Structure 1
Amino acid sequence: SRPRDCLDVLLSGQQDDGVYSVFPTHYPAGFQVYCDMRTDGGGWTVFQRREDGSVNFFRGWDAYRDGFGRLTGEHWLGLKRIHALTTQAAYELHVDLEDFENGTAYARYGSFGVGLFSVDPEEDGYPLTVADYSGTAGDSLLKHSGMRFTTKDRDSDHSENNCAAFYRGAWWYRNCHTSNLNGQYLRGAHASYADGVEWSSWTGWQYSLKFSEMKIRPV
């Protein structure tokens, strides 16, 4: 009756993809999420989806903290929810990607968390833990490990300017990125540099992907 994530939902006998209530250890009010019950046996809690450019992702700090969009479409679950999920157990991250020629690729990370040891994860900038790459998309996240989350209105990156402003996104920017999945929905090849839905190791710095899904499952 109180699953902590989509894997508890699956193991309780819910096999269909869709929206479910989950109740993280330190977020006992709980909230709804999209559960992927198909990928590698299922039990994945979605926290990011791009598929059509219907939702504005060029949002400030409060929106990235609290979440935006709809669970059934393009959304960002919110860093306060991603923190509550990833601190309650050891999670892996799965990233699904699709181009406009219906090509697909994925990146799996054996460890993933946000603000794991932060007393105030919001003040500390929800810093990224990520390690142990495998898959077909190539690694575009390991260089972001240890970076705080940066938005157009709150700069915690390693750049003289604001990486989020410059690359029209919100991410764990260093100086600045190898991945930008919260970037502008520019729809494939673009002249502007690295400011779309980029996964540089698969499609480079001038190709805005059609589809992205970021999702977590206990190791």
Structure 2
Amino acid sequence: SRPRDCLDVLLSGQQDDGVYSVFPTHYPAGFQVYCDMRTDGGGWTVFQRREDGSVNFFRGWDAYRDGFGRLTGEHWLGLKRIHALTTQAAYELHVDLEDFENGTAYARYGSFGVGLFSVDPEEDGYPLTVADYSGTAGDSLLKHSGMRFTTKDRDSDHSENNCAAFYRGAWWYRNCHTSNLNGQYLRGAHASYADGVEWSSWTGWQYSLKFSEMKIRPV
């Protein structure tokens, strides 16, 4: 009837990958999401995908809050939706990654949320909660724990510069990053420093990944 996330959709008997309506506790109008019903038994709610560089990710605060792109392709679900999902239960984060040779790796975090205790999560800058790494890609996110979300037009980072302008993305930047999955789609090895779709622990600072998917499931 009113699944709160893709795990409710899966447990209701929908086994196919695709677009479904979900209805978080504090977002009762609901919205549509892409559900991954295959990974480790399925029930993952996607909030980010890169796969071909068809969508501009170098967007400002309003676009990162509200979301952009298409559920069937490259997209960012919107921090207001990711907040609505991650505050309603205890969620884990799965990150799938692919290089241009179709090599793959993943990073799993047993704890993930954005603006979890923020009265105004937008004003508070949708700060990241992340813990408990396992996987094959290595950890490129724990160093971002506690950081606010920074865009080219809204600086809340630990740099004297704007990390988002500098590394051409949008992220929970410190000074500045170990990961940059909202970076420019630079298509593999690049001379420029750390300004592509980067996961430093797997492919370092000068390799823009082919594919990323960031997705959540209740623990």
Superposed pair shares fold, TM > 0.5: yes
Matches of 1:218 and 1:114 in 2, distance apart? 14
Q: CA deviation at 1:157?
A: 0.1
Secondary structure in 1 aligned to 2:165? Answer: helix
CA distance in 1, matches of 2:196, 2:127: 22
Measured against aligned partners, the alpha-carbon deviations of 1:11-38 in whole angstroms (never above 9, x if no partner) come to: 0000000000000000000000000000
3-state secondary structure, aligned to 1:194: coil
Q: CA deviation at 1:161?
A: 0.4
Deviation, structure 1 residue 187: 0.2
d(CA) in 2 for partners of 1:124, 1:160? 19
Deviation at 1:47, TM superposition (A): 0.1
Deviation at 1:107, TM superposition (A): 0.1
The Cα of 1:84 is off from its aligned counterpart by: 0.1
Report the secondary structure of 2:134's partner residue.
strand
TM norm structure 2: 1.00
Distance 1:15 1:65 in 2: 30
Gaps of 5+ in 2: none
TM (normalized to structure 1)? Answer: 1.00
CA–CA distance in 2 between the matches of 1:163 and 1:111? 25
Superposed displacement of residue 175, structure 1:
0.1
Q: Is the counterpart of residue 51 in structure 1 residue 44 in structure 2?
A: no
Q: Which whole-Å CA distance do the structure 2 matches of 1:161 and 1:130 have between them? A: 24
Deviations 1:16-68 (Å, cap 9, x if unpaired)?
A: 00000000000000000000000000000000000000000000000000000
Offset from partner CA, 1:167-195 (integer Å, 9 cap, x none):
00000000000000000000000000000
Distance in 2 separating the partners of 1:189 and 1:102: 14
Tell me the CA shift for residue 100 of structure 1. 0.4
In structure 1, C-alpha distance between the alignment counterparts of 2:114 and 2:205, rounded to whole Å: 25
Give me the whole-angstrom Cα distance separating, in 1, the residues matched to 2:121 and 2:102: 38
2-structure distance, mates of 1:67, 1:206: 27
What SS class does the counterpart of residue 164 from structure 1 fall into? helix
1: distance between equivalents of 2:197 and 2:45? 21
CA–CA distance in structure 1, aligned partners of residues 74 and 111 of structure 2: 24
Unaligned runs of 5+ in 1: none
Once residues 106 and 152 of structure 2 are traced to their aligned partners in structure 1, the CA distance between those partners, rounded to angstroms, is: 28
Query: Offset at 1:121?
Result: 0.1
Query: Deviation per CA, 1:121-176, whole angstroms, max 9, x where unpaired?
Result: 00000000000000000000000000000000000000000000000000000000
> What SS does structure 1 have at the residue aligned with 2:164?
helix
Provide runs of 4+ in structure 1 moved above 3 Å: none
Give the whole-Å Cα distance in 2 for the aligned partners of 1:199 and 1:212: 10
Percent identity over the alignment is 100
Aligned residues: 219
Instruction: Look up the match of 2:9.
Output: 9
Provide the rounded CA distance (Å) in 1 between the counterparts of 2:35 and 2:97.
Answer: 17
* Aligned mates of 2:64, 2:87 — CA distance in 1: 18
